[model samples]
Target: SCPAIHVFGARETTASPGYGSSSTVVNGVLSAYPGSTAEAINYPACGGQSSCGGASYSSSVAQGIAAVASAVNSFNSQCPSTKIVLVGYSQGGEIMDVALCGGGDPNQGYTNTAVQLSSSAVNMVKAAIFMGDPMFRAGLSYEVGTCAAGGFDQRPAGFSCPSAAKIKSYCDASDPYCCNGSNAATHQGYGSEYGSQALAFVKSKLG
Candidate 1:
């Protein structure tokens, strides 16, 4: 009985709100898939309790990548037949890009030995959903649609985007993290329209 599975990587300083709820914050479409199982990933710099400012962005991204890898490994090892869906928001989206983009780790980030995953885990990924993704590319991706009202630019200096394959990244036209706005409203709107559409899209893909 292998069901569709959605694993989440949330923003920095976020609390993984238990399984499907993890996508609620950045609206990476974590819920709405009743038939899918959800795995919420939490870490010191990104989830549970911690000061998001204390850690270097690189370190936070590293820890999250390792943690996400471990979780993906377990799912692959334990539930080999289930299909895998990925969701990443804000900082979480960064993890999604590095993991699936086939690009080498950006900035030569250090990967923790403790958080490494078997190659089988990486091979299990089927699709990805991204919202408020800091890694968003203005003119590229598998799909470049604005789930929000505005668009801004927040790209890192040396970073590039994922191939136009399995990456479906959403950016509010106004979100400072990815688009053009710096207001909380734009980034905050993802939980509704952004998430639901993503859910339906994933369902269709699986169907």
Candidate 2:
């Protein structure tokens, strides 16, 4: 069976860690896996209205789901027998969770092509890695209603895996803001640790 991978870029600019401005982190991810079919999709609304700064948590989530659903549909048409690997960064991560957890309404924008994925094709989801994901916050009700509370540190309670079974490894580290320290310090280190770890997870799962 063919293996397919989709890398979802973070809000606003593109994929995470800033990557020195001109770098295409999603494309870099695709190149990391030789012979693997990979695609990097950009959500225009990720970086707010101007598409520069950060985006609203809810809006990012909705966009993320739609992008993934679209990719899944494309995969079905082009490579029906392929398995799938999804990677998301920052708000992109939250979007993947929304898609899997059925949080976003397709009628509202988040499509549901995943429903069309055959049982065999469904089995191809090797791994899902989220870098700097705010799903926990979304689950906790801390930032579910407002955009300001959507920062990395806004942790409420009972916010965890929507479906732990489908996820091989879910790592939230170096996020002192969300998982450890005060909110101001929480948003740091979302790139290197999260990105590298995600890459490793995908490599292992896909292998």
Candidate 3:
């Protein structure tokens, strides 16, 4: 089956052209063989505090996951033989948790409309690459960087991500989402240091 590359951009990153996760996925898709399809999500995941409940992060996560689940279902319906490769960052990356399960372990205290995909649609995904995911579930995840001391913010008991060798997750040292201290620069600089590595991982998955 042929594969499609679908990317979900982080909150507020889409406002800036070629600035965040979308750029990384676009570059990776360009580096792949001809006939690759990489499309960025058009979901409303506001990073601004505008009644999304807990900060801008809350609804962004749910909306991003819904976007992903809906698109996957559409691809499956239109092209039944198509496999999928996913790329996301920050809240975008955090969506993968809900995509796998309608609810998180012990519950993240939230749910989304796209939470109920069929088993066939779920199996259509080959790889899901994440960067700066908040629900990283460290130690269990194979993240890059040893990360200096004083990186972790708070330990939250979260759901266990699906165990697949191709689930490549990248988190820079002191990243606010996964790590701590609101590492703003490191959060946005992933495309340069981690871009090529992520590209290679996507290549391996598609190959």
Query: How do the predictions measure up, each by TM-score?
Result: 0.72, 0.60, 0.76
Q: Which 10-residue window of candidate 3 scores lowest in summed lDDT?
A: 146-155
Q: Which candidate, 2 or 3, has the higher TM-score?
A: 3
Off by over 4 Å in 1: 1-6, 9-12, 16-22, 25-35, 46-53, 104-119, 146-164
lDDT digits (tens) for residues 88-184 of candidate 1: 7666666656666544344535432221445666556666777766656565635456533323223344444433455577776667766766666
Positional deviation of residue 73's Cα in model 3 after best superposition, in angstroms: 1.6
lDDT of 2 at 25: 38
| Tens digits of lDDT, candidate 2, 1-207 | 555554434342334433221123344457786656555545533545444336554556565566666766566556765656655555555555555544443323545433333344345666665544554443342121212333342333444444444543232433442333344333434445345655555567666
lDDT-based ranking = 1, 3, 2
- Count of clashes in candidate 3: 0
Q: What ranking emerges by TM-score with the best candidate at the front?
A: 3, 1, 2
Of 1 and 3, which scores higher on lDDT? 1
lDDT of each: 0.58, 0.47, 0.57
Alpha carbon lDDT at 87, candidate 2 = 57
lDDT against true structure, model 3: 0.57
lDDT of 1 at 49: 34
Model 2 stretches astray by more than 4 angstroms:
1-32, 45-47, 52-57, 104-121, 137-163, 168-180, 183-188
Model 3 TM-score, 2 decimals: 0.76
lDDT of 3 by residue, 71-123 (tens): 67777676666656667666666666456444542233454424444566667
